[PDB]
Structure formats: C-alpha cells, structure tokens
Write a protein that binds this ligand. Structure first.
Ligand SMILES: *[C@@H]1O[C@H](CO)[C@@H](O[C@@H]2O[C@H](CO)[C@@H](O[C@@H]3O[C@H](CO[C@H]4O[C@H](CO)[C@@H](O)[C@H](O[C@H]5O[C@H](CO)[C@@H](O)[C@H](O)[C@@H]5O)[C@@H]4O)[C@@H](O)[C@H](O[C@H]4O[C@H](CO)[C@@H](O)[C@H](O)[C@@H]4O)[C@@H]3O)[C@H](O)[C@H]2NC(C)=O)[C@H](O)[C@H]1NC(C)=O
Ligand SMILES: *[C@@H]1O[C@H](CO)[C@@H](O)[C@H](O)[C@H]1NC(C)=O
Ligand SMILES: *[C@@H]1O[C@H](CO)[C@@H](O)[C@H](O)[C@H]1NC(C)=O
Ligand SMILES: *[C@@H]1O[C@H](CO)[C@@H](O)[C@H](O)[C@H]1NC(C)=O
Ligand SMILES: *[C@@H]1O[C@H](CO)[C@@H](O)[C@H](O)[C@H]1NC(C)=O
Ligand SMILES: *[C@@H]1O[C@H](CO)[C@@H](O)[C@H](O)[C@H]1NC(C)=O
Ligand SMILES: *[C@@H]1O[C@H](CO)[C@@H](O)[C@H](O)[C@H]1NC(C)=O
Ligand SMILES: *[C@@H]1O[C@H](CO)[C@@H](O)[C@H](O)[C@H]1NC(C)=O
Ligand SMILES: *[C@@H]1O[C@H](CO)[C@@H](O)[C@H](O)[C@H]1NC(C)=O
Lengths: 133, 105, 128, 133, 133
C-alpha cells in the first residue's frame, strides 16, 4: 500500500493522517534510548530514558481521565462549541493538516481538556447508579 | 446541454428557485452539481457544491437540492445584491465542470 | 485568505499565441489545483482546464485538447503554510472568436469529491 | 459551583468526595517535578521524578489486574463480607470521611485486593469461553 | 487449592499456565527495587528501578495498540495462519509449555505483532463510522 512512515503524513490532510496513528503511537517510547555508568554520555542517556516515559505517561494520564484508555480514536460527549472553530467538516478533514489545525485550536486546547475531564467523571457516576439495581 | 431557467424574479424577503437539468450525458444522479454566483465580467463566487453543501461563509438562505432529473438552487430572503447571473455546473471527482446556460435573477 | 493576481489585459490579432499569468499568495500554491476558465460573450462560460502545481498533472476539456499549454513553476516557501506561485496559459490555432474575459481559480479542497473545483478566482483579463 | 481543590474534600463525606476524584487523579503525576546535571539539587530532583512515576504505575497496575483500567468508579463482583465493616450504606457515604474509613478498613485492604485479583482472572477466562462459539 | 507461585507453572501445559497469569502479572513492577545517594549501590539500584518501569510499559504499549489494555486474556480478529504452527488445539494447550511454544513461534512473533496492530487501527475507525449516525 502506502506506508509513509513515522510522521510521514505530517503534511497530509487530517483525514488521511487519521488512518496511520499506530505509526506514531509505537515510536513514543522505543528507539535506542546495560549498566548505569554515570559518565557524560551515561548521565545524558539516563535523562533521555526517564524523559521518554515521563512524557509518554502524561499523555496516557489525560487519555485515562477522559475514558479513552488504550484508544487511538475515541468519541466523546462534549459538543463542538463553534467558537472554537467555525470551519465545516469537509474543509477540516479534506483540507487542513494536523499541524495547522493545532495552530488555530491552540487557545482552546485547555478549555476542551476540562470538558472531557468532568464529562468522564459524571459518566462513570451515571454508570454506577444504573448498575445499582 | 445543461439547461438552466430562462429567467425569473421575486422581491425583498421572498424566495427564488433556479433550475438546472440535462440528459444522461451531464445529469444527474451520477454527477455532482455546483452553483456559482457570477456577476457578468467579474470575479465569480462559489455558493454551493456537492448538490447542496454551501461554501465557507455562504448565507444559509442559499440552499441546493438535486432530484434524479434536475438540480435546484433556492434563494430565500432576497436582498439587493442578489441581482446577478447564476450558473450551475456538473462534474465528477476526476473530470471537468460543464457549466450551465445561465439564469438572470 | 488567498490572492490570485492576473496578467495585463493587452490585445492581439488572430493567428498569434498569448501567455496569461496568475500569481498566488496567502496559501500553499502546491496544495490546490489551478483552473483556467473562459467567459466568452458569444457563448456560455467554459471550463478550459486545471493543472496540479504539486504533481504537474493537467486535465483540459476536449475542445481545448491540442490547442492549449498549461504550465506552472515551483512555489516559493514564505512561511510554513504560505507560498507564492505562478500559472501559465497558452493557445495554439488562435483566432478572434476566442475573445472574452479569462480567469484563474484555484481548487476547493485537497481531497474528497470536489478537489479541483474552482473556488477562489482572480480579477480577470480582457483580451482581443 | 463548588470546586474545593486538590484534596479539598478530604474532610467531606465519602459520597461528596466521590464526586471530585478527577481533582486528585490529575495531580498524581504532574506538578513541577532540561539537562540532567548531577548536583545536590539535580540528584534530588531526578529521584523526585522517578518516584512519582513509580508510585503512579503501582496504583495503575492494581487497577489493571482488577479490570478497572482507566476508571475512577468501577464496580466489581466481590461481595462485601460484613466482617470487614458492618456499617450501613447511609452511615458510610453520608457520615464517614475517606480518611477515617481507610483507618478502619485498613486490616482487610490486602484481603480485598486478592478477591478483586482472581475475580478478574476468572472473569476474563469466562469471556473467552463465551466467545468460543 | 494449588497456587504454584511466581513462574510456578513454567513447566505446566499452556492451558494450565493460562489460569495463573495474575501470579506473574503482579510481580512485573514490584519486588524490593528513600533518598537517592549516588554510591556504587545507589547507582545500581536506580538503574534497577528505571529498568523495571521501562520494560513494563513496553509490554503495556503493545497491549494498548492491540486493543487489549488492562487485559490478561483478550481475543483478536487476526486468524491463525497455519504456516505459523500447524499443531492442533488439543496438542497445544494440553501438551506444550509456554516456553517451548515461544521457542517455535519465535520467528513469526514480529509478523503477528503487526497484524494485531493494524487490526486495532481499522477496528477503531470502523467503530467511529458506526457512531456517526
Ligand atoms: C501532498 O499534497 C498534495 C496537494 O494537496 C496532495 O495531492 C493531492 O492528493 C489528493 C488525494 O490523494 C488528490 O485528490 C484526488 O484527486 C483525484 C483526481 O486526480 C485523478 O484525475 C487525474 C486527471 O483526470 C488522473 O490523471 C489521475 O489518475 C492517475 O494519474 C496521475 C498522474 O500524475 C497520478 O498522479 C494519480 O495518482 C493517478 O494514479 C487521478 O486519478 C480524484 O480522483 C480523487 O477522488 C477520489 O478519491 C477521493 C478520496 O481521496 C474520493 O472522495 C473520491 O470520491 C474519488 O474516489 C481525489 O479527489 C489531489 O488531486 C492531489 N493534488 C492536488 C490537490 O493538487 C498529496 O496527496 C499530498 N501528499 C502527502 C503525502 O501529503
Ligand atoms: C461556548 O463557550 C462560551 C465560553 O467559552 C460559552 O459562554 C458559550 O455558552 C458556549 N456556547 C456553546 C454553544 O457551547
Ligand atoms: C483550508 O484551510 C486553510 C487554512 O487557513 C483555509 O485558509 C482554507 O480556506 C481552507 N479551505 C477551504 C476550502 O475552506
Ligand atoms: C489566541 O490568543 C491570542 C492572544 O493574543 C490571539 O492573538 C489569537 O488570535 C487567539 N487565537 C484564537 C484562534 O483564538
Ligand atoms: C509547453 O511549453 C513548454 C515551454 O518550454 C514546453 O517545454 C512544453 O513542451 C509545452 N507543452 C506542450 C504540450 O507542447
Ligand atoms: C468472611 O471472611 C471469612 C474469612 O475472612 C470467611 O471465613 C467467611 O466465610 C466470609 N463470610 C462471608 C459471608 O463472605
Ligand atoms: C486490626 O488489627 C489490629 C491488630 O492488633 C487490631 O488491634 C485492630 O482492632 C484491627 N482492626 C480491625 C478493624 O480489624
Ligand atoms: C500466510 O502467510 C503468508 C506470508 O506470511 C501469506 O502469503 C499467506 O497468504 C498466508 N495464508 C493465510 C491462509 O493466512
Ligand atoms: C526460524 O528461522 C531459522 C533461520 O535459520 C530457521 O532455521 C528455523 O527453522 C525457523 N523456525 C521456524 C519455526 O520457522
């Protein structure tokens, strides 16, 4: 088929990049990063090791508090406030790239992260009350 | 070959309905219809594509509809700037956009 | 955004072959097709053809099949998502019945069914 | 609304604290904890970094072997042996705080952790046999 | 009952070992591995700490990109290409041990890891399209 490679679809449309997410997901913790000798290269490599797991788990932490654990494409119950981006679907997924999309959605990325957070807290509270009978 | 309405008019607040039809060569159920607002001798404007999808910023009063034999363009709630000439267009994903005859509104 | 400035509106006489330019700004010139449209007075507006500033692939109507040369030169990176481009247009067995206003319009989307659709137009040029 | 803050409902009832779990969940790995210089403050901070991820994953490990991955309120199939606490529901969730509750359930916290563990091993074995047709 | 212990069923049949997976799952991050003094034993222990979490997460990363997050026995949609092993079920789960099974499936372990990877990417894309109505 195609298989562009790691970040190979960085310039492709959002919909086309949304079909090769495993390509980036698997390289978020591996690479080349057995004794711990504290030389100038050893201290350098140890930090490179702790830094990878740290950043990897911070993304999985947010993915957990949203109810999206172990997911690449999860859907939510947070509606799209058009003040975030009034662009239409066809001019988003068949037009923009993820890089320029993140550039314009950047202001509201912290707002959306809160709506996904409490929506998961209330949804799990709803599921518990439904299983109380 | 893609015939449009001869002409028609309305009034401020009312609505219009432009027509666009043709034979099996350029219409319809296996083709997409785009509606261009085109003042004579000026920069045109894309109003609606894919039979009924509006372009970014097009007023919601513009609406497209496609039957199995003729595509339509409704222009509800008229305004002064509506006095232009409209042209329909039939296309597929990998071809050309055969324009229409024209419709003075 | 996006701008497409066209060449001058000079005139020639039958038998010749004129070149029409179209300079783009405010958008990545490679990401969208470039269409050539003709609005003659003695005919309905005609779609002449589009070309890919990225892949070089061109597609013109059979009425212009062996009479028109469509060319574009490579863009110039301005920012990460902005570039300047240029598209060219020529006619072969040219007469005076091809008189009218000529436009250049870029594609609509980068993918889907309405990819090459002329969406953003130029100011046009008057001919012979 | 309310929003008491991190540990803000530590003195509230168990039911009231059971509505602000995301407030504590998000601060279990972040904070302020870019080169690795091994000074007295650098060694101190590096340990602070490894210690956070270590303790964070040990809680997620137990949450995984119970079938509660990425959950804040998951329900189980382990019935409540009244010898753990004969208190009634109304005098638990509308009365006690999580601190004093953990103080009295402390003896059986290792007993319950085993019942949730093998209940998940047997449940996944049951689901496999049900999908064998 | 039985309870053989950590790796206690290493020589048992695959089916018998497939009933005590929690026994190995819980010891993949704990053990004995509070200040960070960088002595010969301190540097040695710090590496032992980072090495455990690193290897633990690499297994959970693959388990995530396969849609098996927080699972001990998950079923997939990747059929068994008999060129991997033409052995029958009864002579696999009531005969072989996991050690000798991994010895003969070792060549195709990277092939199977790719089929489980894109099967999860396409399945989540299918679930999104089904919830688009
Ligand atoms: C980088 O950026 C560029 C620019 O944006 C991207 O190039 C664009 O890619 C998109 C998607 O791949 C293209 O959209 C498609 O357009 C085709 C129309 O082209 C067809 O018609 C040609 C003329 O008739 C024909 O010659 C072509 O056939 C072959 O020949 C050329 C020769 O060069 C060859 O290059 C082709 O690859 C062909 O092998 C061609 O078929 C249209 O058919 C597509 O529609 C189908 O697919 C969509 C889904 O994608 C579907 O919705 C439709 O219903 C239909 O099924 C589609 O619209 C676009 O034309 C490209 N060019 C532009 C925009 O200028 C490039 O992909 C980016 N790459 C990366 C890695 O980021
Ligand atoms: C959008 O967000 C603003 C504040 O960010 C809020 O006041 C408004 O009600 C929201 N509207 C919708 C439709 O969600
Ligand atoms: C595609 O995205 C760019 C990003 O700025 C935007 O300018 C352009 O209008 C979009 N295309 C369409 C057809 O909306
Ligand atoms: C984000 O905020 C900055 C603050 O100056 C503003 O300039 C910019 O336009 C904002 N962008 C969006 C998309 O809201
Ligand atoms: C178009 O013009 C260029 C200019 O050099 C030429 O190389 C090319 O062959 C021409 N195209 C055709 C089809 O003749
Ligand atoms: C409660 O636990 C004890 C041992 O901890 C056990 O002997 C007893 O059967 C249990 N009773 C119930 C009702 O679960
Ligand atoms: C827990 O064990 C200690 C051991 O001395 C005992 O004193 C205490 O009462 C026990 N508490 C409970 C709740 O079982
Ligand atoms: C088995 O795998 C080989 C390559 O590894 C492939 O060519 C073949 O089609 C596969 N057969 C089946 C039945 O999956
Ligand atoms: C694996 O590959 C080696 C390469 O030499 C080969 O000898 C061995 O037989 C192979 N085993 C299987 C099970 O394919």
């Amino acid at each position: 088929a195609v298989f562009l490679g790691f970040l190979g679809a960085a310039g492709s449309t959002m919909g086309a990049a949304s079909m090769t997410l495993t390509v980036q997901a698997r390289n978020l913790l591996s690479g080349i990063v057995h004794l711990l000798k504290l030389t100038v290269w050893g201290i350098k490599q140890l930090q490179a090791r702790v830094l990878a797991v740290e950043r990897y788990l911070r993304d999985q932490q947010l993915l957990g508090i949203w109810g999206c654990s172990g997911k690449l494409i999860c859907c939510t119950n947070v509606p799209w406030n058009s003040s975030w981006s009034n662009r239409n679907l066809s001019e988003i997924w068949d037009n923009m790239t993820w890089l320029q999309w993140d550039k314009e959605i950047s202001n509201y990325t912290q707002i959306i992260y809160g709506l996904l957070e409490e929506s998961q807290n209330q949804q799990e509270k709803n599921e518990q009350d439904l299983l109380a009978l | 070959v893609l015939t449009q309405s001869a002409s028609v008019s309305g009034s401020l607040g009312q609505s219009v309905t432009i027509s666009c039809t043709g034979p099996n060569s350029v219409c319809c159920s296996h083709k997409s219809i785009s509606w261009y607002q085109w003042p004579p001798g000026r920069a045109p404007t894309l109003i609606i594509y894919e039979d009924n999808e509006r372009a970014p910023g097009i007023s919601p009063r513009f609406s497209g509809y496609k039957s199995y034999w003729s595509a339509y363009l409704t222009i509800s709630d008229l305004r002064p700037e509506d006095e232009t000439t409209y042209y329909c267009c039939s296309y597929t994903h990998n071809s050309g956009c055969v324009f229409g005859t024209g419709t003075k509104v | 955004q996006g701008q497409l400035v066209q060449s001058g509106a000079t005139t020639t006489k039958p038998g010749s072959s004129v070149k029409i330019s179209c300079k783009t700004s405010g958008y990545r010139f490679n990401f969208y097709h470039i269409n050539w449209i003709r609005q003659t007075a003695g005919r309905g507006p005609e779609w002449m053809g589009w070309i890919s500033p990225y892949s070089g692939d061109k597609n013109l109507a059979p009425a212009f099949q062996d009479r028109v040369n469509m060319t574009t030169d490579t863009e110039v990176p301005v920012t990460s998502f902005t570039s300047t481009g240029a598209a060219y247009m020529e006619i072969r067995n040219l007469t005076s019945d091809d008189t009218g206003t000529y436009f250049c319009a870029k594609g609509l989307l980068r993918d889907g069914s309405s990819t090459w659709l002329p969406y953003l137009w130029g100011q046009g040029t008057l001919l012979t």
